[PDB]
């Protein structure tokens, strides 16, 4: 295989109720569009929650975001070695790691589980990947009822998604309720009926 | 806003001064690919597909976090020791699958808007604490530079037993209990 890499964190300039805490964060954000034809590296330097200095591959140099990192951004731009290595991580980190997303992440397709159960009627569409999904409610002769309540796309945090659409209708003794679900992992849509 | 098809976070480097703790993890589209056990120097991938094909040297985390610790000391003095301000978390409990008694499921306790990333998350079954079947996600990054951690509890749904997710944070004046019942 190929060992993946992360963006390197540039070194800095200088050589009563709850306990106090001081947080530092570094974020190496790679942005991809239309494969690797449009890649962009944005490294974020955070103190607590304040982004003070960042590198943007569209800019090419370190720019200070808040008055907290004019010293740092001007220090990393004067060091030619830090600049050439940060500009190179667009290929060294972003383009390099994306090759293994094509082999693993971008091929993941988990089929959703579609169940209907009273709470009125709730169609639970759970455990699917990726995020794109389309859930319609139908009553009897292809009546796409619009009076529905759907949650936002729920991220379970284990590489699976979940969405719970709810339909409020007056069911007569001869109606039929079907949940129509579409997902990129499905060659044909999943339909689940009800009385 | 940066419009992209896929937003990767190849390096969620975190270091905080409280009980010198830190975290290294890569994210893709908001999902944690792996984290690095900085104690054991081990790369823990979060999918069998990742363990089978993906590789990452855990030494990179220990090297990068060592610089995180250095940069933190310089901004502490530069910011006049501006300490982090606590946030009130957003705790939500729900199930991964529709719950039917006798058929096993797992309870998902989402704790959003975590800052600073110091939290205690417990599952309570009829008042008593749960020990078995409890997994936990790393602190995931957010665009506002706060975090959200998700805890998991695999359980056997019984109408007799009820469950509560207990969350303790400095931004809370009291431990937050979120109840869930079949």
């Amino acid at each position, epitope marked *: 295989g190929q060992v993946e890499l992360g963006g390197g964190n540039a070194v800095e300039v200088c*050589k009563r109720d709850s306990p106090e805490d001081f947080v530092y964060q570094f974020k190496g954000m790679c942005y991809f569009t239309n494969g690797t034809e449009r890649v962009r590296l944005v490294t974020r330097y955070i103190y607590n929650r304040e982004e003070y200095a960042r590198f943007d591959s569209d800019v090419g140099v370190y720019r200070a975001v808040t008055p907290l990192g004019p010293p740092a951004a001007e220090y990393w731009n004067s*060091q030619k070695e830090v600049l050439e*290595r940060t500009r190179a991580e667009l290929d060294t980190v972003c383009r390099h790691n994306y090759q293994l997303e094509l082999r693993t992440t971008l091929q993941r397709r988990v089929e959703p589980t579609v169940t209907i159960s009273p709470s009125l009627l709730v169609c639970s569409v759970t455990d699917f990947y990726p995020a794109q999904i389309k859930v319609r409610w139908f009553r009897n002769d292809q009546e796409e009822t619009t009076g529905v309540v759907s949650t936002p796309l729920i991220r379970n945090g284990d590489w699976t998604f979940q969405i719970l659409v709810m339909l409020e209708m007056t069911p007569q003794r001869g109606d039929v309720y079907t949940c129509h679900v579409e997902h990129p992992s499905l060659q044909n849509p999943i339909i689940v009926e009800w009385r | 806003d940066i419009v992209a098809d896929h937003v990767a976070s190849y390096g969620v480097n975190l270091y905080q001064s409280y009980g010198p703790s830190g975290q290294y993890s890569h994210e893709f589209d908001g999902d944690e690919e792996f984290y690095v056990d900085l104690e054991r120097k081990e790369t823990v991938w979060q999918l069998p597909l990742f363990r089978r094909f993906r590789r990452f*040297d855990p030494q990179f985390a220990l*090297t990068n976090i060592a610089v995180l610790k250095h940069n933190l000391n310089c901004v502490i003095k530069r910011s006049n020791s501006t300490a982090a301000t606590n946030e009130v978390p957003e705790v939500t409990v729900f199930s991964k699958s529709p719950v039917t008694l006798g058929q096993p499921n797992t309870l998902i306790c989402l704790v959003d808007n975590i800052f600073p990333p110091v939290v205690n998350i417990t599952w309570l079954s009829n008042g008593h604490s749960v020990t078995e079947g409890v997994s936990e996600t790393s602190f995931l990054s957010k665009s506002d530079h706060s975090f959200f951690k998700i805890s998991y509890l695999t359980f056997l749904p019984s109408a007799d037993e009820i469950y509560d997710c207990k969350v303790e944070h400095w931004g809370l004046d009291e431990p937050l209990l979120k109840h869930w019942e079949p």
Partner: T-cell receptor
Amino acid sequence: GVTQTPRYLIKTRGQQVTLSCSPISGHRSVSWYQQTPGQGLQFLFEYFSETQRNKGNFPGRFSGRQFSNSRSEMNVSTLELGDSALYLCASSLERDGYTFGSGTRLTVVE
Amino acid sequence: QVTQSPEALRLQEGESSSLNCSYTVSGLRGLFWYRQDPGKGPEFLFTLYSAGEEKEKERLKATLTKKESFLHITAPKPEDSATYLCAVQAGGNNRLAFGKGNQVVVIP
């Protein structure tokens, strides 16, 4: 520039040596290396902010430390005839660009 | 690891030549070229990050590919006689995996 002390040193078997290296002003990382014939340049360990951040495949008797002035020492306990080498020292800002010093020439004699 | 060819290279003054450095590492962070006199320490030359990158300094030129790296010499002088060392940096360790060098001797 990078300074290494001493330039030449002689010691017998079983004894120890301590080699010093002052990096370039403004630099925080110090890498140690061993240059032997037949084995070439071999990485000892790297020090950053007074702790060993990276290490090589040398045994435990190859140790060192780093001080507040980013200056580093390396110590070699229980010397050996195979330990005779030129011990180089690379100075770095932290990760990008490594400037080697003149080196310490150590010769272990029976 | 990494290997450089040829190990020795004696050439008369004025004739151009090329040095080779073939590496096999996973997660390359940068390839380094160095120059070393026998008693001295290594002198820095180049640092190549991406494939197809060309960086030229004085009578030297460093090229990087996905499999190897070339260090071309143009009209060398007797001072150019030195052990040219090639190093790679890969993975999470900031160490330098040096090759065995090219003992270059340029005769006047």
